[PDB]
Each structure stands twice: as structure tokens, then as C-alpha cells.
RNA sequence: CCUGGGCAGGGCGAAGCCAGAGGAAACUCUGGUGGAGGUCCGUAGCGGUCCUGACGUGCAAAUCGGUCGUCCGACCUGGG
RNA sequence: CGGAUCCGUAACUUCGGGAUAAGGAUUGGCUCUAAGGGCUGGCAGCCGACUUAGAACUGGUGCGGACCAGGGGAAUCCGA
RNA sequence: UACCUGGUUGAUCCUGCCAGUAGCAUAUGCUUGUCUCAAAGAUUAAGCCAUGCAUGUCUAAGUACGCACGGCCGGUACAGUGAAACUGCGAAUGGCUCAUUAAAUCAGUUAUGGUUCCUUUGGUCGACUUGGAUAACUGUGGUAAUUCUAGAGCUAAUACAUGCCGACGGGCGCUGACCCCCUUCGCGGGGGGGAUGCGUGCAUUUAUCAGAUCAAAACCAACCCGGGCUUUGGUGACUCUAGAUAACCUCGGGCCGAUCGCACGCCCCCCGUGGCGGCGACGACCCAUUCGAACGUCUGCCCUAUCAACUUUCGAUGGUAGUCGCCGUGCCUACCAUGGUGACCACGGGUGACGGGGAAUCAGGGUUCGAUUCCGGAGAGGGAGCCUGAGAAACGGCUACCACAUC
RNA sequence: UCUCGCCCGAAGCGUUUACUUUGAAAAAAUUAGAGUGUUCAAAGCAGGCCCGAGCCGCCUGGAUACCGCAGCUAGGAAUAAUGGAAUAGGACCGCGGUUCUAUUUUGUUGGUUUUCGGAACUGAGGCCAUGAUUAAGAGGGACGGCCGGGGGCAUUCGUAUUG
């Protein structure tokens, strides 16, 4: 849905569908892009309703360069979340390691539904989408725990 | 004077970043030409790489494309409604890349005639003008050729354009940058987006 | 800085020009040309340093502008026109003719091949495209742009090019079992048969090579120049097949004297 | 002492409450709601500081004009 | 100086204040724009309150236009 | 060189420091015969400068009526050396210093699919010569003077401009008067052909269409043979390159040669008043390419908690369009959401901190410097703005203020 | 898996890193270090032979190593974390039924209906030795017999002191 001033990606909407005059399906004009790299396009990009300027599977955002991994911290920001990459920095003097981390804010495509805090996620380098975001959510790996559990109500 | 440098900003965190340049040459920011709707006036600007770039102070004509039937005609710009990014520029009558323009319906009337006879939008007058419509009389198989164009494909414009053409105006979205390329190019609204923007304009007349 | 540079320091010169320390502060910066400065070879260094044709630098400027030196069949007026890998250097008034290949150590050498091979030049395909009205175009690492080449030329292939008419003749493709020569990296001047290439989607593919007596190296695609068709060199090659010997084998050769 | 009467608007924003964020706990932080005070500017009212102003055989055997203190109170006030 | 709005507010302290501290800016006329609601129907149609924010134009720098209306700071003595 | 010695006590043992020891690099004393290399106003003052120099430039191949020089040279303009001036290109590299600057520059890693690029090297490059204007020069002046210029007259071109021929018409694009056969009484239907007219090339900006991975039938409506046929490229990926169609093409107006030298011979013909012109120098739209440049991704930095919360009306993080820019982006505007970082050291101070490659110091591990010859950044007294140019916020370029300071 | 050209080429192709051994990759100068009589040496990158000038000449070098950390590539699976199947919403083979489209072939164009190829949805089974490492002289908790000037509240007693 569009609840803003306009959203319409590239594909020409009006194929003069009154050739007999009929209701019909109208989800047919959807742009569909493979990123390649052996990473499967999810089917939410196939049968979605959303129009996103910055989605890697709908927009013109190419994917190149580096492929990193992190874990989801927060989701408060609109269509973009904040991941955290831990690692081990070496010191030559003491000859053992220490932990460090640098929080990366990454653009989250809305096709990746149910993306609960704590999962290992994979990101790819892009062009600068915004001021602090330079990566894009490539593939969500885990649900971080058990999907199967259910509680009362 | 205006520089659009990113280094006078704060950081990722928000600490103040110390300046160490002096707003160098390759980050020029030039003042914006608010493109009016008057008779044609375009200045040039020398740009890095020697490429000539055009400021348009006011434009009148523009290149616009009908959607479905694929027509493209040089047409005058009349009125500007619903910029949808800043409502100041509506009253200012400024043309930008995404802006919605009323367009004289006349240079599509003669095309729709000349390819698509028994045209539309003639105020139901029926004695008015010499419309070389029926005079040519269409002797050979060209009549059946135009009849398959006109009634088998049925040439209908999905209401929304009937009511615009009997009032003689047309809604089109700009699709080029008048401050950059000096041309007010654009495409005519059709169907879904047309009734969407018409709903927004009726809401503007409401509140 | 402001715009492009216009000098080059003698210490900042690349290693393979065999330049000296106590001589001067300035290296010859080669002109902008069809070869990069990290891989090129200046004409003033070629005539002055290695061949011992001219003692000073100015004598090279005198002879080249008195038209004695031609490159690829035609005279270059410059004293610092950059050369490249696999270029024809012909000299007119003295019967002499030169070819630029790599030594086993990594350097340019002298290779006095005949006019029969002056006619024939190899080159590597950089990329391929189409232009106006649907016509093809091939781009060379020697910055030759040539239209209507062939339909059966892969991107990383080798074209034998003629310097008479400038039109291609007798291409050779890229395939497992072809003899290639290394033009870059730490293993340049190595000549061997392509064994196995690995293709990555990370924009940098690797190639393993073996040669005679079975020694195997590995490198990247832009460092590779296909030189033969199934262990048969198109072009004569200096010092055997140009195999790198060993440190110990170099020592034993110089002890054998 | 008894019985009745009277006091425009506003500024400050406690207890109690709500929501959100943090914390392991103790609890903390932020935004509201809330309307306490012998509480702050100020009306009527009550007093009378200064001008040592006007008057000073006056309007008058203690008044007038500006300038003032206090106004939910230990407040002001009639009758018995 | 004085109303209001928007900024900003020290020393000291019983931590409640000081505090409208000190110091600034803005304030007109006229065109709009945006937001803040009620009643009806199986998300849509009719009917209305006086407030706030922003923009342009413009007047001889002029805007609390009269009336209305806190000079302020630094200290000392005494008395809560 | 994997190294110790004296010193508290009346005497011993011990923790502990003090002082002796050896380098290095700044200064200084005394002294000093040769020879080879060899740092040097960095430390305090990135304080002030007298003077003189440090960026200019010509080929047979842009512009020669100079007064200079004289070829043989008579006249059909011009040969030649050529001062001076116009044009073009370069003065944005180099050289100096380290005051600012603590994920900022930097070093490694990578990519521009999100960009620009003078030059070089390729590819593309399908009217017997038109127009004014100016400098050098000539005279003529001004002011105490500067690389000061006014006015009067002259002329140039690859300065500026204007602008044509060829060339066949092609076939497609849409129109289009018209034509051949069948059916039908005609009407009409069906099948197959065609005078004119408007456009056209590549760049510019929109819009739309076409766009590839595999292989057998049952029918019916039409009809081709002797039951049986028709097909741009690449990456990992595109909105890439390329086609096809509708139009635009901006008076501050993209391209499509009114340039120049050498060699002189050959052809037809009717005179050459026509061709055949081989060889070169220049530039011009774009595509490459080379030199880079700029912003990007990841990782790494000294001391400090007597700096623990910071950021957000005048952007703090993001979403949506857009302006601006070479392009991507809170780079800027408007609207909307309320975000972002931090005890794994945020934010804030200090540095007698420019960063590295490196230097000194010898068991091994380190510690202390790196002003400085190479890479990169910054600034020309502070600090702000800007023209030209492919390339500058240039300072041996310009504009104003401040602080000096000359005549 | 034999789709692609009995087997390999090729391809699925990784739960995922830390760790190693490769291999690239990088810039010189410096350091280590090879060669070389700068008269030695610090240096420098040169030089060395025959030829009585006559060969209008020959041979050879200007090495290699080191380049923290971070990133790339392929072997190794011990060490140290992580993955799976417990309310089955497992694993694998073979069916039903629904629903959706892709290009070949019916000489050729089009339409109607398929076989089919792929995704998905749904239901019914059979099949797995069908699925949970044992209980730390780690720990927590239950338990039950006592234990203690342990803690708090309340109560009672005792002399003595002082009056
Ligand atoms: Mg209205
Ligand atoms: Mg410099
Ligand atoms: Mg009070
Ligand atoms: Mg008060
Ligand atoms: Mg008062
Ligand atoms: Mg009162
Ligand atoms: Mg009174
Ligand atoms: Mg009184
Ligand atoms: Mg009184
Ligand atoms: Mg008195
Ligand atoms: Mg009196
Ligand atoms: Mg009071
Ligand atoms: Mg006070
Ligand atoms: Mg008071
Ligand atoms: Mg006192
Ligand atoms: Mg008192
Ligand atoms: Mg000592
Ligand atoms: Mg100075
Ligand atoms: Mg850079
Ligand atoms: Mg930079
Ligand atoms: Mg804003
Ligand atoms: Mg400093
Ligand atoms: Mg040492
Ligand atoms: Mg050491
Ligand atoms: Mg430097
Ligand atoms: Mg500078
Ligand atoms: Mg300079």
C-alpha cells in the first residue's frame, strides 16, 4: 500500500487493460531482481505489496564488495535495524586477545519478516543509502532459539 | 559560498568534528533556480569537467508522454497543483522533478483525431467546426484498418480522462530536473495514480 | 595536491628499471600512454641504461627526434613514450630489432628477433562491447580499440595482432592446457601451462600453473598472458622456456661458470 | 463570645497517580496528570511608607493627590 | 525596565529556592497553508468551535504603538 | 657480549632506593696533521623582513607591409634571419615548513554498477574562401610614481564570429490518390499490390515495447510446397551495452574542418581556368585507455574518570519525495517517525601530537623517538570570498576586513 | 546428481567462526643477506675476458629473505565455543487430490483441450534399532534424626549495688 505521497518503482502500470473490460488480478506489474551470488530471493519479493526504494530485491540497490555477519540488537528505527559484530583484536605485547565491537546500522528490507532480536544475520556492502547506513540485510540465517515453543494465549 | 560538505556534520555518535579544510573547490553548492512558468529563459553554468549545465529560470513548453497509446507532444504548461513535498512551491509555481502539472489538452485532440477518428471532448456541440473527420470518407481498406484500431481495441480512456478532456486539461507528472537539464519532461497520469492524486487534490480543496 | 602530478622521484621509481642511487634525484616519469606506469618501461632508460647506446639522456632526445627509433612500425617523437609488455621495437638505420618480454627474475631483457617476427605482435583482450548500430568492439591492454573482431573471442583471450594493417589474425582462446606467461605480481616472468582455474563471485579468480619439471604457481587473471596453444609457443622466448631456476640453482650455475 | 456576610484574574508546581526507558535487586531517569501553600504579581477591601508633595484662619478640630504593604488569611466586617 | 512568546540563567543554600535572577531577540497590517472535532451508514457522507505553528507580500525600523506596567547587580548590620 | 659495584649497621642477612657503567642525539670546554663520505634557523618565533634572484615558451608545419638584417631580384602577393605583439599551452608540478588536526589525516584492504578526467595512444570522424573587431606600429598626452593607461589612424589569424557545396536518393516509420484476382445480381466480404505528403544521422532529455534454454499430440478457423521450416552481446548480478517506436533538441544555441607545411609529378581534356593529389602538423562530439582525483567498506592510534552520561529549535538517527552537486547520501528544504552512542571507555580536556615506511636501544619480550630527503595530508601573517582554467578556494593570481609595514 | 560432456569433467557447495600449513597480494629506500678487490672499509651496483690497435667485440649481474595486525584462497578437524529432533511443526522413499504457469510439437498463423516441466498447497500412510550422553568427591533443591551463648519478640529468676 501507499500511505505516503507516492510509491511506484519502475514498471509501467497501465497496459490499457480495458480490451474487453474486466476486473482481473493487478499484482502482475511487479519488478523482480536476482542479486545473484548464490543467495536465493525470498518469495515475499515475488508476491509482496510493498514498494521500497532501498530493497535489494526490488530497488536499484546493487550489492558488491564485502559480506559480513552480525547479530540484531534493536528494531526501533523504520525499515532499518542495528547489528553488532564481535571480534577478537590481537595485541603483540601481551600476546593474547581482547573483545571489541562496532555497532553497524543496516537497512532492513521488509521482505525478511519475523526477524526477532538475537539472530545471526548476514549483510552486504552497498552504495551509501543514508548518512550512517552503508550495508544491506542480505540473508537472515537463524530464528535464535526455538520456533516451536508456545505459551498461554 | 554554500558548500555541501559532509565534514561539518557531527559523527555517528554526535561528538563535534574539528574542521581542518577550508571548504574546498570540488564541493561547490550553487544557489537554486526556482523554475517559474513564464516564457523561456535559461542561463548556463560552467561545471567541473567543462560540461555545460543549464539553469532554467522559467519554462513554458515541455515534452510530455501519454501513457497507454504512446503519444509524445510538445505542449504548453498551464498550472501547477500538489507538489506533495513542499506546499510553498505550489503557490510559488515552481517546477521540480516530482511535480504535478496541468497541461493543455489540445495537442492530444488532433493526434487522437488523426490516428483515431470519431474523437472525444467536443463539448457535445455537433454543429461546431470543420473536422475533416467525415470529409475524407475513407475509401479503401484503410477504413476497416482504422475501425479495428478504433472499436476492436475500442480506444477507451477509462473515464478519468473523459472528464478531464471535456473540461480540457490534463494531469501529468514531471520526470526530469528543470534546474539541471533545462527541459520540463514528463508523463501523463493514468488510472490508479490519477485517481490517487485527484483524491489528494479534492482533500486539499476540502481541508 | 592540486590536479595531476608531473614528476617522479628516483627512489620512488619501480624496482625493475635498474636505476641507481647516486645518479640523480629525479626518475624519468614516463608519459601517459597505453600502459600503466607500474608495468611500463621508458625509452630513455631502454636506450640509455641497458643497451648502452647513449651515455647521456640528451643524446636519446637527439636520436629519437632525428627519427631513428620506431615503435610498432612507426616513429615515436617522444623521448619518454612508455612501452609495455609484448611490444615491437624496431630500429631502422642499423639493422637491429627488439622485443619486450620478461626475464625469469622479473625484469625486461634484450631479445633480438627478426623482421619476420616484427610483423607479428601478441596482445591480451581487456574487454568486449558493442557500439553504434549494433557493431562489436574489442579493447586491448595495449589500448587498441578494434571493431568487428570476431564472434568467438572470450574476454580473457589473446589476439595475435598485425602492425602493418592493424587488423587481427589467428586468435587463441583461454582454456585448460594452454601455455601462458605471467605479467604481474610476485611471480612475473614465469611461463607455464594453465592447470586449473577457480572462479569466485568475489570478482577475483585464481589460476594454477605448471611448467616443465612440474613446478606449480598460482596467480590472478589480470596477471596472465596466454602465449601458446597446447605447450607450443607462438613467439620465441629467451633463455629456454624462461623457467625460474632456484637460488641454489643460480649459485650452482655461477659456480659451473 | 454568638450569629450572619465578603474576597477578579494570573505566575511558582509538593504529596498522590499514569506511561515510557534502564536496573539483577534496591531503586533511578524522562514526559505528563495532579493543584498543596500562615505561597508570589495584582482587583475590591484594609492600612498608611515616602514625596518630610497639596492644604495648613483648610473640604476637614487629621483630609486630598501620586507613590505604596496585604489580599485564603494570626484575614476583613454589620448586629447582639 | 515593565505585557507576552522563544532562548538562557550564576554565587549561595535548610536543596524547597534563588528566579520574572543577569542578559538577548521577536511582536504591526494583509493574503494563505498545516494541525487540533461532532453527527449520520453498512471505511464513506453531512454539520461546526476558537486556538496554535509556519510561509509570502508590505509599510519612511514601524509594531505591549493609547491604556495597562518589576530598574538591576555587588556587599554589610539587624530581625528568621 | 643473557654481566654488575660502593653506600644505612659495632658486625651479618634482607626489602628498598641513591650513586657509579655503556650507548645514542642536542649544546658546550680544551685540542686537532691527512683523506673519503657527510647533518645543518626543526625545538624558543607558522615572529618581522632590506636587497637581489626563484616561470616562462617557436617549429619546413597558427598570425610578418618593423623602423632592424638583405636575398639576387626582376617584379605574378608570399622565400630567408627575424626584435615586438596576438593566439595556444604551462605557471594547480616542483621547492619550503609541521602551527592546527586523535577513526581526523594516515597504513593495509578493497569499489565506483555511485563519478569526473587537459594530455598521450587507438576508434569514430557520410563555397573558388564570408563577416566585422583588436594588439604590436604610428603619432599624441596625463600624473611624484607602479607590469598606470586614455583618446586619434592602420592592419592581421587556428582570437572572435557567420555559413555553404557534395548526394545518391535509399528503405523503413505513418499517411496516401490509385491497382490485380475471387465470391456476390449488387450491397458487401475476402485475398494480394501501389503516385504523392511528413519524417530521417550521432549526441541531449523523457517515455514505451521487445528481449534465451527442454519436448510430443487431439481438433477447428485461414492457406505454403513437393505428409513436411527460420532464433543481438556480458558480468556473480542491472534500470548494463545494444536494438524498435513516439517527440524534444534550450539566442549564455553540442558534433557534422571556410586551418597549415613538404614533395612535385601524373591523367583525361577543349584552354587547365579541372582532376589524380602521396606525405605530414593542429583540433572535435563521444567511446575506450593512461596519469590521477573524490567520496565510499573493514581494521588499527598517545595520556586523562579531580571528564560517565552525551547527541536533538540553527540535523541528533531514520522513512518519504525533492533542491543542490560530477554522482551516491540529512549535503540542504518540507513532512513524518523518536531515534543514535556508552564502563568492550562514549562525550569532553591535554599533547613541548602532523601520520606512516623507519631510527636509537642487542638473550628473548619490549621501551623511547619518528621536525626532516620516500608515500600521503595541511598552510602560505589570521581568517573569509572568488574569476580563469581539464584541474585551485591557488596566494612568486584576485577582492574586502583585521594586525603589521613601504613611498 | 549423472541433469551437463562403469568413471571423471561439471554441479549441488557448506552450522560457522576461532586455530594452524599453503598460496597469492604489497613500495620503494632502511635491516638481514648473495655476488663484486671502493687500493681496505663505510660505500657504490658494478664489472669481467680475449684481442701485441684488428672481435668495426663477447659473458654476467644489479639477487633472495623479512614486511605486525586486518581482508582473500585452498588442505588439516586435535584443541575451544556454536548447530540440530522432546508438546515432533523431525529424517528419507513412494502415492493421492487441489492450484499455478514456462517452451517444444500437431507444413504455417491463431484459438480450444492435454500430456508434460517447475513452484506451491493439501491429505493419507508405510519406513528409521524412530528421536532426550550419565549423573562430576561441580552445583541447586526436596527429604529426616539431631545440633548449636545463631537471630528476633515475649516471659521468668537471681544475688549484689544504691536509696
Ligand atoms: Mg476548500
Ligand atoms: Mg606539492
Ligand atoms: Mg504569603
Ligand atoms: Mg519576589
Ligand atoms: Mg503594584
Ligand atoms: Mg489594594
Ligand atoms: Mg484609602
Ligand atoms: Mg489612612
Ligand atoms: Mg494620608
Ligand atoms: Mg508635608
Ligand atoms: Mg494658604
Ligand atoms: Mg502578596
Ligand atoms: Mg540576589
Ligand atoms: Mg514588591
Ligand atoms: Mg560579619
Ligand atoms: Mg519581621
Ligand atoms: Mg643513574
Ligand atoms: Mg613569517
Ligand atoms: Mg585520495
Ligand atoms: Mg581525503
Ligand atoms: Mg529540517
Ligand atoms: Mg603541534
Ligand atoms: Mg636490541
Ligand atoms: Mg626485540
Ligand atoms: Mg612531503
Ligand atoms: Mg594550499
Ligand atoms: Mg606556489
Q: Please answer yes or no on whether A13 and B193 come within 8 Å at the CB atom.
A: yes
Query: C69: which strand partners?
Result: C91
Residue B75 CA to residue B105 CA, distance in Å, equals 9
Round to whole Å and give the CA distance between A125 and A35: 12
| B112 contact partners, CB below 8 Å, separation of at least 6 | B69, B71, B119, B120
* Distance linking the first and last C-alpha atoms of chain A: 30
- Cβ–Cβ contact B13 with A under 8 A: no
Find the Å distance, CA of residue C199 to C1' of nucleotide G9: 16
Cα R_g (chain C), whole angstroms: 19
What residue in B sits closest to A19 (Cα-Cα)?
B153
* CA separation for the pair C72, C63 (Å, rounded): 17
DSSP letter for B81, please: E
3-state SS assignment for residue B154: coil
Helix ranges (DSSP H) in C46-204: 58-65, 115-118
Query: In sequence order, which residues have a C-beta less than 8 Å from that of residue B154 and are 6 or more positions away?
Result: A18, A19
Report how this structure was experimentally obtained: cryo-EM
Helix (H) or strand (E) holding B206: helix B192-206
With 0-12 / 13-18 / 19 or more C-beta atoms within 10 angstroms meaning exposed / middle / buried, residue A107 is buried
What radius of gyration do chain B's Cα atoms show?
23
Contact B95, B80 (CB under 8 A): yes
Give the bridge partners for A135, in sequence order.
Answer: A106, A125
Whether the Cβ atoms of residue A78 and residue A25 lie closer than 8 Å to each other: no
Instruction: Please indicate whether, in this complex, the C-beta atoms of B196 and A14 are within 8 angstroms of each other.
Output: no
Give distance CA B140 / C1' F155 (Å). 72
**Dist. CA A98–CA A91, nearest whole Å:** 8
Say how many Å lie between the CA of residue B58 and the centre of ligand 12: 66
Contact C162, C214 (CB under 8 A): no
Q: Stated in angstroms, how far is C199 CA from G13 C1'?
A: 13
Neighbours of A127 (CB within 10 A): 12
Q: Which chains touch A (3 or more CB pairs under 8 A)?
A: B, C
Distance A94 CA to F17 C1' (A): 29
Give the residue from B26, B32, B30, B31 showing the smallest Cα distance to B49: B26
Question: By the 8 A CB rule, do A134 and A123 touch?
Answer: no
CA distance A71 to A68: 11
C-alpha dihedral sign at B130, B132, B136, B137 = negative
- Contact of A37 with chain C, judged by CB distance below 8 Å, is answered with yes
Per-residue DSSP letter, B40 = -
What secondary structure, in 3-state letters, does C114-128 show?
A: CHHHHCEEEEEEEEE
Whole-angstrom Cα distance, residue B134 to residue B151? 17
Q: How far apart are CA C24 and CA C4, in angstroms?
A: 23
Rounded CA separation B77/B54 (Å): 19
Nearest nt to the B175 alpha carbon by C1': F206
Residue A102 sits at φ, ψ, to 5 deg, of -135, 110
Rounded CA separation C166/C160 (Å)? 10
Exposure string for C39-52, b = 16+ CB within 10 A, e = fewer: bbbbbbbbbbbeee
Best residue in C202, C203, C204 for a mutation probing chain A (most A CBs within 10 Å): C202
Q: Least CB-CB distance to A13: which of B98, B156, B190?
A: B190
CA triplet A8, A12, A15: central angle to 5 degrees?
A: 135
As a whole number of angstroms, the distance between CA C17 and CA C7 comes to: 16
Cell of C70: 620506431
3 state DSSP class of C40: coil
Cα separation, B183 vs C50, whole angstroms = 61
- Which three-class secondary structure string do you get for chain A? CCCCCCCCCCCCCCCCCCCCCCCCCCCCCCCCCCCCCCCCCCCCCCCCCCCCCCCCCCCCCCCCCCEEEEEEEECCCCCEEEEEEEEEEECCCCCCEEEEEEEEEEECCCCCCCCCCCCEEEEEECCCCCCCCCEEEEEECCCCCCCCCCCCC
Residue C135, classified by CB atoms within 10 Å of its CB into exposed (0-12), middle (13-18) or buried (19+), is exposed
The 3-state DSSP class for residue B25 equals: helix
- Cell, residue A97: 586477545
Whether B159 contacts chain A with CB within 8 A: no
How many beta carbons lie within 10 A of that of residue B81, not counting itself? 15
Query: What are the strands, taking DSSP E only, across C51-153?
Result: 69-71, 74-75, 88-91, 96-99, 120-130, 136-140, 145-147
Within 7 Å: CB of B60 and strand F? no
Contacts 24+ apart (CB under 8 A), A47-52: A48/A110, A48/A111, A49/A1, A50/A110, A50/A111, A51/A2, A51/A7, A51/A8, A51/A9, A52/A79, A52/A109, A52/A110
User: What CA–CA distances, in Å, run from C13 to C1, C118, C134?
Assistant: 19, 30, 44
Residue of chain C whose Cα is closest to the Cα of A65: C202
Copy the grid coordinates of residue C69.
Answer: 627509433
d(CA C41, CA C110): 13
Annotated resolution, angstroms: 3.4
The SS3 call for residue B97 is coil
Buried b (16+ CB within 10 A) or exposed e, C1-33: eeeeeeebebeebeebbebeeeeeeebbbbeeb
Q: Which residues in chain C have their CB less than 8 angstroms from residue A38's CB?
A: 201
Q: Which residues 73-132 on B are within 7 A of strand E at the CB atom?
A: 87-88, 91
Between strands A97-107 and A135-140, the pairing is: parallel
The answer to whether B129 and B113 have CB atoms below 8 angstroms apart is: no
> What's the CA gap between C188 and C222, in Å, rounded?
12
Pick the residue from chain A with its C-alpha nearest to B12.
A132
- Tracing cell 606506469 back to the chain, one arrives at C37
Amino acid at each position: 500500500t501507499e500511505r505516503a505521497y507516492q510509491k511506484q518503482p519502475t514498471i509501467f502500470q497501465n497496459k490499457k487493460r480495458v480490451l474487453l473490460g474486466e476486473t482481473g488480478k493487478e499484482k502482475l506489474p511487479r519488478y523482480y531482481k536476482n542479486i545473484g551470488l548464490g543467495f536465493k530471493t525470498p518469495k515475499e519479493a515475488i508476491e509482496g505489496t510493498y514498494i521500497d526504494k532501498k530493497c535489494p530485491f526490488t530497488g536499484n540497490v546493487s550489492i558488491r564488495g564485502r559480506i559480513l555477519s552480525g547479530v540484531v540488537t534493536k528494531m526501533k528505527m523504520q525499515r532499518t535495524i542495528v547489528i553488532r559484530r564481535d571480534y577478537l583484536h590481537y595485541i603483540r605485547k601481551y600476546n593474547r586477545f581482547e573483545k571489541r565491537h562496532k555497532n553497524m546500522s543496516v537497512h532492513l528490507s521488509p521482505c525478511f519478516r519475523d526477524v526477532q532480536i538475537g539472530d545471526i544475520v548476514t549483510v552486504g556492502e552497498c552504495r551509501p543509502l543514508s548518512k550512517t547506513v552503508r550495508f544491506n540485510v542480505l540473508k537472515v540465517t537463524k530464528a535464535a532459539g526455538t520456533k516451536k515453543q508456545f505459551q498461554k494465549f | 559560498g554554500i558548500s555541501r560538505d559532509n565534514w561539518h556534520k557531527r559523527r555517528k555518535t554526535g561528538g563535534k568534528r574539528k574542521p581542518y579544510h577550508k571548504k574546498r573547490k570540488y564541493e561547490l553548492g550553487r544557489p537554486a533556480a526556482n523554475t517559474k512558468i513564464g516564457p523561456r529563459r535559461i542561463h548556463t553554468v560552467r561545471v567541473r569537467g567543462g560540461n555545460k549545465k543549464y539553469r532554467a529560470l522559467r519554462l513554458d513548453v515541455g515534452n510530455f508522454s501519454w501513457g497507454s497509446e504512446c503519444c509524445t507532444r510538445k505542449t504548453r504548461i498551464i498550472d501547477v497543483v500538489y507538489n506533495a513535498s513542499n506546499n510553498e512551491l505550489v503557490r510559488t509555481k515552481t517546477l521540480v522533478k516530482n511535480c504535478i502539472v496541468l497541461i493543455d489538452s489540445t495537442p492530444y485532440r488532433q493526434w487522437y483525431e488523426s490516428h483515431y477518428a470519431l474523437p472525444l471532448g467536443r463539448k457535445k456541440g455537433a454543429k461546431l467546426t470543420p473536422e475533416e473527420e467525415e470529409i475524407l470518407n475513407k475509401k479503401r481498406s484503410k477504413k476497416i484498418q482504422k475501425k479495428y484500431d478504433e472499436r476492436k481495441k475500442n480506444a477507451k480512456i477509462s473515464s478519468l480522462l473523459e472528464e478531464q478532456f471535456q473540461q480540457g486539461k490534463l494531469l501529468a507528472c514531471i520526470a526530469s530536473r528543470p534546474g539541471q537539464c533545462g527541459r520540463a519532461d514528463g508523463y501523463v497520469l493514468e488510472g490508479k495514480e490519477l485517481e490517487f492524486y485527484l483524491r489528494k487534490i479534492k482533500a486539499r480543496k476540502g481541508k | 595536491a592540486r590536479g595531476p602530478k608531473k614528476h617522479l622521484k628516483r627512489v620512488a621509481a619501480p624496482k625493475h628499471w635498474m636505476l641507481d642511487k647516486l645518479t640523480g634525484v629525479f626518475a624519468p616519469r614516463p608519459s601517459t600512454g597505453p600502459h600503466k606506469l607500474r608495468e611500463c618501461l621508458p625509452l630513455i632508460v631502454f636506450l640509455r641504461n641497458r643497451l648502452k647506446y647513449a651515455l647521456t639522456g640528451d643524446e636519446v632526445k637527439k636520436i629519437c627526434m632525428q627519427r631513428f627509433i620506431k615503435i610498432d612500425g612507426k616513429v615515436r617523437v617522444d623521448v619518454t613514450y612508455p612501452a609495455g609488455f609484448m611490444d615491437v621495437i624496431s630500429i631502422e638505420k642499423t639493422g637491429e630489432h627488439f622485443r619486450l618480454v620478461y626475464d625469469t627474475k622479473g625484469r625486461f631483457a634484450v631479445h633480438r628477433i627478426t623482421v619476420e617476427e616484427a610483423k607479428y605482435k601478441l596482445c591480451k583482450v581487456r574487454k568486449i562491447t558493442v557500439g553504434v548500430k549494433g557493431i562489436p568492439h574489442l579493447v586491448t591492454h595495449d589500448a587498441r580499440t578494434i571493431r568487428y573482431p570476431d564472434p568467438v573471442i572470450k574476454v580473457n583471450d589473446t589476439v595475435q595482432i598485425d602492425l602493418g594493417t592493424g587488423k587481427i589474425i589467428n586468435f587463441i582462446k583461454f582454456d585448460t592446457g594452454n601455455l601462458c606467461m605471467v605479467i604481474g605480481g610476485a611471480n612475473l616472468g614465469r611461463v607455464g601451462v594453465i592447470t586449473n582455474r577457480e572462479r569466485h563471485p568475489g570478482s577475483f579468480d585464481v589460476v594454477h600453473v605448471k611448467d616443465a619439471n612440474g613446478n606449480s604457481f598460482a596467480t590472478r587473471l589480470s596477471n596472465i598472458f596466454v602465449i601458446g596453444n597446447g605447450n607450443k609457443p607462438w613467439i620465441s622466448l629467451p633463455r629456454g622456456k624462461g623457467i625460474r631456476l632456484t637460488v641454489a640453482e643460480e649459485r650452482d650455475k655461477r659456480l659451473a661458470t
